[PDB]
């Protein structure tokens, strides 16, 4: 298993108001330029949220949600500072509850 860090918000906020996939795209391009393995992803309606270890987060989460996920904690620290209205946390994967850290429930 590896540890995944996440910032979770509503689709309203992260897909429409502040389409964060814009910032992710420029980060992906810069990673490419530097020959760096991409270690961050946007996941819409993430399946990880149904894991028992994340019950507290699911209990507070928007009905229609989306996560920025990374194996680099630093990045998620900055995503939280950048967006602020996001829940944050971490999980280990793959596991029984989270067989695919990047899977969507849609």
Residue numbers in the entry: 1 to 106
Please, what does the article write about this entry?
A fourth Ycf54 mutant in which residue A9 was substituted with a glycine reduced Ycf54 levels by ∼75% and CycI levels by ∼50%. The FLAG-A9G construct, which like the A9G point mutation was present at lower cellular levels, pulled down CycI in quantities similar to those observed in the FLAG-Ycf54 control pulldown. Therefore, it is reasonable to conclude that although only a small amount of A9G accumulates, there is more than enough Ycf54 protein available to interact with CycI, so allowing the MgPME–cyclase to proceed unhindered. To investigate the structural basis for these effects of the A9G and R82A mutations in Synechocystis, crystal structures solved by molecular replacement against the WT Synechocystis Ycf54 were obtained for these two proteins to resolutions of 1.5 Å and 2.2 Å, respectively. Thus, the phenotypes observed in A9G and R82A are not a result of the mutant proteins adopting a different conformation or failing to fold. As our pulldown experiments show A9G Ycf54 interacts with CycI at levels comparable to WT Ycf54, it is unlikely that the reduced level of A9G has a structural basis.
Mg-protoporphyrin IX monomethylester cyclase (MgPME–cyclase) catalyses the formation of the isocyclic E ring by cyclising the methyl propionate side-chain at C-13 to the C-15 bridge carbon between rings C and D, generating protochlorophyllide (Pchlide). Recently, the small monomeric protein Ycf54 was identified as a second candidate component of the MgPME–cyclase. The Ycf54 protein has been identified as a component of the MgPME–cyclase complex.
